[PDB]
Design a protein around this nucleic acid. Structure first.
Lengths: 137, 138, 52, 172, 197, 190
RNA sequence: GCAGUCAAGCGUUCAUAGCGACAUUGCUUUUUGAUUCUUCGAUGUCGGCUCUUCCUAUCAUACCGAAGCAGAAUUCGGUAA
RNA sequence: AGAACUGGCGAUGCGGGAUGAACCGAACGUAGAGUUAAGGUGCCGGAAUACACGCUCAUCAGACACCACAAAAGGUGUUAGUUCAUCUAGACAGCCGGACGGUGGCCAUGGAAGUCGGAAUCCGCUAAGGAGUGUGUAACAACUCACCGGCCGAAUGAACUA
């Protein structure tokens, strides 16, 4: 067709109002959001709704998210939780598949043998449905 | 020196902003050197035209806010290859000799400024038939 | 028999050049440094000797 | 040569009947411990005045907290230092959040771009600026643009295990 | 964690690989390697070549045959690069190597089996963009090897026998993803969600 | 100082298309098509519209920067190629020995041929690549021209013909004989 | 023994095509010395002959560049044992 | 080769420096356990392919003292820095508008109108103009610069250093 074509790798950008994810330290698995940028790899974030302190860090232990919201730069921590929950972003993060696996593997950890042998036999009682289901079709 | 030359330009600018009650901001885009020069001899009667850097023009007019405060509105029209034909003759005469005579179209009149007043130059060419419809219909 | 135009056309490819005092390469006449490593991208250059 | 601290250090030449109440001298010093902050104090006071460790005394030794340690700040650094062939001066700038890490970054830079160690290097002055456009370098101005954005490609998954089961990706 | 580990060298580096291979063999973890022909090495083809040439000449001056056997096959490059990362005159070093076999490409009894990757040793992660690397099969043939065309020939054969298997399998799962979701919304399943499943 | 972001813009004219995927460029237009590989750069594009494209690099060195500028030229070349075509003019030279020139096919190989270069016995052979076309001049003397869409193959086959007609064991300052490029332009814009 | 740097000056005019003063930085162990660490209850202490190998600071052959290279003839240089 | 102070080898193992009489550490009954040295932690090999800021790509990379070697002088390879200069009164660089008239300035001639060549460097309106830095016609017509001004809007060169 007459319309030119380009595929561009849609990358997660860095910006104010970008939500992140912290991987190491006291904030493992927590969420935060940038307020400002410093260099290629250093930042000024905050996690007030989560309780992570406004600080600096490398972008090495931090992984960026597909999520983002609108936010003025340099806005002190009060503004953050404000603009944060104003967007209801944890829930968006919650509705994400990403968050859902974390809560899965965690529950898998916190299990008990009686819950494991509960799971085990349950899969079978489930799985027997699938065969007589998945042979006719 | 070089800045004094920019200053040499500013003097004639302010000289004619004040020495002349009116000035026709005319578009010197496309005006040839033989065309700008033939603008003088016909304007040698009253009007004097002054060219330079628009940046120097606005930066000249930007400095005349203490007195001549109404000159603030010259800056939005200092645009493109346009310049002032400082003059004192009536409207339709210099307007015609600027735009009609010795025109290669070609310079028009971007703006006619006098006494803190702005004209679009459209009704300036109104010869007649505009007051008759207003005086008769009223 | 052979004309200056073609000659100057040949000069651009065969004479209008420059050379290093060390790397001895046939270089652009406007160049400033040699395009060879062994000499070290040096700056000692000259014009090729215009014939006769 | 650590995670640093900024100390304010006050000392004076030892008093006598001749001069009670000498003239104190304050300096804003960078190091790991208050010990060294006394050392480099005497190291400099020598060069500036007719004193030593022994004719002198510390009157106070305090650590400085940073006034605004989340305010990202464009820090401008005049510097002096020494090379294999002599003495040099500089003015160099960083955008960062504290005077401290702004230096902890410096010495590492200097220790790679000109191969200097803490012993060769002197720090002279450190300043916040009030207004942008007072900057003079470019890699700093690279970050001062309105509505700035940029990516961080080639995300890498430093594995926990050794083996894997997937040629990984890097989309980020 | 496995009895046997098949490893593809495609995209790998020789050095970073054999290290993490060696310390696995001395621990008993049986290894085996494939697509050795498609390893990568830093530096351009020329340096990684010459460094072979300088080694190529290095030879027992007075009888070349007892001197350094300069194997050229990418298999026995990675092997040598592995052996040199081992105390290989001991028996510990010997049984370590009966624990290992290296091949070019992927012969029958290993092709229908899984093979893996080693994130510590990847061009695409460990090695920066914008630096020249070097394939080995370009090189082994540039120094005596022959069979680069053969492997590319015998390889493209199975890959057809592979794509059959994959898409044959692919739709077979979309079948599953259908007949499973009818049970996904079952009280049996709602419990599993309560337990992390 | 590790430029965080630098970009260059390309124009695509009307009646033209361009198709990118995995940095494998295709370029199509009135002359025909052009295809390219550029996997040897780690860079990004973007179609902002069917009429303009940006190329940029994010957080890269200096030698990774220059490769932004050149890639601008290539697609600028390929675009102009399949639209305007490319056209490279030569001129024979001889002060004594008139060069003979022909074009010949060995199974359609389309070999260029040369004889009598300084009256030598040796016949020379340069092949004619794909995408290039040849025309000897008639309005003008000994101005054989090559033209096509791939400036690479063209100026290559041109220079292949320049270095092959080079002098041996003499002072070239005198012996200016050979087959030299004179002018190089397009098929369009006259 | 061998190779560099600078450039006063030769090279008709021009420092550097080839040359290169006044100096200066170095290399090699094929020169001679210096020292004496081994060996004086022990190394068969000149040269030639035959025979293999190795280095390059290449004399010829192959590919090339520059010239005070018109051709021929030569000179400087490069890859190369 | 020979002197001074001190410490060591000889007379002394041990860990490390791959190897090594003198270096670093440390001096010892036989055993066990714990911690550390100096050195080190990709594999050989016990120990972090640990973290982090930066520099480096070498068609001959470099990789820890005693130590098994290198210099002069150079490099628009690359980075950082210094010193000076142009430019918001609009610069550079890139593009764009006039490239006028006294005026085709004087000689040279079949023709040379600012450009084969010889000789003058002046004046007007001028934001400006070289009596022209340059293209093309037989010669006009037909353009880009000097100089100046419309465009984005602020970077750019020179000598230096490590």
């Amino acid at each position: 067709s007459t319309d030119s074509i380009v595929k561009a790798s849609n990358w997660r950008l860095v910006e104010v109002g970008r939500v992140v994810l912290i991987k190491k330290g006291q904030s493992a698995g927590k969420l935060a959001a940038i307020v400002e940028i410093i260099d290629q790899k250093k930042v000024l974030i905050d996690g007030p709704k989560a309780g992570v302190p406004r600080q600096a860090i490398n972008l090495g232990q931090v992984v960026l998210t597909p999520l983002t919201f609108a936010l003025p730069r340099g806005a002190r921590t009060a503004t953050v939780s404000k603009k944060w929950a104003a967007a209801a972003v944890c829930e968006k993060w919650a509705a994400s598949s990403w968050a859902k696996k974390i809560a899965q593997r965690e529950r898998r950890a916190a299990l008990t043998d009686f819950e494991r042998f509960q799971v085990m036999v349950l899969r079978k009682q489930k799985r027997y449905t699938v065969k007589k289901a998945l042979a006719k079709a | 020196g070089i800045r004094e030359k920019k200053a040499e330009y500013f003097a004639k600018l302010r000289e004619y902003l004040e020495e002349y009650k009116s000035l026709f901001v005319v578009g010197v885009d496309n005006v040839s050197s033989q065309q700008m020069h033939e603008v003088r001899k016909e304007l040698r009667g009253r009007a004097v035209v002054l060219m330079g850097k628009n940046t120097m023009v606005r930066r000249a007019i930007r400095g005349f806010l203490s007195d001549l405060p109404d000159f603030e509105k010259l800056l939005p029209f200092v645009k493109g290859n346009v310049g002032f034909v400082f003059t004192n003759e009536p409207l339709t005469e210099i307007k015609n000799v600027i735009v009609s005579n010795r025109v290669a179209a070609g310079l028009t009149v971007v703006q006619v400024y006098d006494n803190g007043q702005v004209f679009p130059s459209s009704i300036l060419d109104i010869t007649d038939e505009e007051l008759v419809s207003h005086f008769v219909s009223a | 028999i052979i004309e200056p135009s073609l000659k100057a056309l040949a000069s651009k490819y065969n004479c209008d050049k420059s050379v290093c005092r060390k790397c001895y390469a046939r270089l652009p006449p406007r160049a400033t440094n040699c395009r060879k490593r062994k000499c070290g991208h040096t700056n000692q250059l000259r014009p090729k000797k215009k014939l006769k | 040569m650590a995670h640093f601290k900024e100390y304010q250090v006050i000392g004076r030449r030892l008093p006598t009947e001749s001069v009670p109440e000498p003239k104190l001298f304050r300096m804003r010093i960078f190091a790991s411990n208050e010990v060294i902050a006394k050392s480099r104090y005497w190291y400099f006071l020598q060069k500036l005045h007719k004193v030593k460790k022994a004719s002198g005394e510390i009157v106070s030794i305090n650590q400085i907290n940073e006034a605004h340690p989340t305010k990202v700040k464009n820090f401008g650094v005049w510097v002096r230092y020494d090379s294999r062939s002599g003495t040099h001066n500089m003015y160099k700038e960083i955008r960062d959040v504290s005077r401290v890490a702004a230096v902890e970054t410096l010495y590492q830079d200097m220790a790679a771009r000109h191969r200097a160690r803490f012993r060769s290097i002197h720090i002279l002055k450190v300043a916040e600026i009030e207004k942008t456009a007072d900057v003079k370098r470019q890699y700093v101005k690279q970050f001062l643009t309105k509505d700035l954005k940029f990516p961080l490609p080639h995300r890498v998954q430093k594995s926990t295990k050794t083996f894997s089961y997937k040629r990984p990706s890097t989309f980020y | 964690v496995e009895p046997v580990v098949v490893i593809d060298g495609k995209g790998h580096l020789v050095g970073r690989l054999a290290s993490v291979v060696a310390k696995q063999l001395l621990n008993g973890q049986k290894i085996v390697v494939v697509r050795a022909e498609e390893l990568n090495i830093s530096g351009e083809f020329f340096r990684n070549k010459l460094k072979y040439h300088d080694f190529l000449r290095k030879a027992t001056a007075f009888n070349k045959t007892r001197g350094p056997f300069h194997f050229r096959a990418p298999s026995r490059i990675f092997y040598k690069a592995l052996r040199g990362m081992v105390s290989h005159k001991t028996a510990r070093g010997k049984a370590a190597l009966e624990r290992l076999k290296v091949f070019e490409g992927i012969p029958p009894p290993y092709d229908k089996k899984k093979r893996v990757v080693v994130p510590q040793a990847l061009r695409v992660l460990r090695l920066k963009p914008g630096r020249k690397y070097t394939t080995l099969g370009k090189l082994s043939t540039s120094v005596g090897w022959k069979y680069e065309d053969v492997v590319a020939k015998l390889e493209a054969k199975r890959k057809v026998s592979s794509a059959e298997y994959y898409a044959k399998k692919r739709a077979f799962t979309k079948k599953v993803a259908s007949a499973n979701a009818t049970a996904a919304e079952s009280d049996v399943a709602k419990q599993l969600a309560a337990l992390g499943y | 100082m590790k430029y965080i972001q630098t970009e260059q813009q390309i124009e695509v004219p009307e009646g033209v298309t361009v198709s990118i995927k995995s940095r494998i460029v295709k370029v199509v237009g009135p002359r025909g098509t052009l295809t390219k590989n550029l996997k040897h750069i780690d860079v990004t594009f973007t179609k902002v519209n069917n009429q303009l494209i940006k190329v940029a690099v994010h957080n890269g060195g200096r030698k990774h920067v220059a490769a932004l500028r050149t890639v601008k030229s290539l697609v600028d070349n390929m675009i102009t190629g399949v639209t305007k075509g490319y056209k490279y003019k030569m001129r024979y030279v001889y002060a004594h020995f008139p060069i003979n020139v022909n074009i010949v096919e060995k199974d359609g190989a389309k070999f260029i041929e040369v004889r009598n270069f300084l009256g030598d016995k040796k016949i020379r052979n340069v092949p004619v690549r794909d995408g290039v076309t040849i025309e000897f001049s008639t309005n003008v003397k000994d101005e054989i021209v090559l033209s096509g869409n791939s400036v690479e193959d063209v100026s290559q086959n041109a220079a292949d013909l320049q270095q092959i007609c080079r002098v041996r064991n003499k002072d070239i300052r005198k012996f200016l004989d050979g087959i030299y490029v004179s002018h190089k332009g397009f098929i369009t814009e006259d």
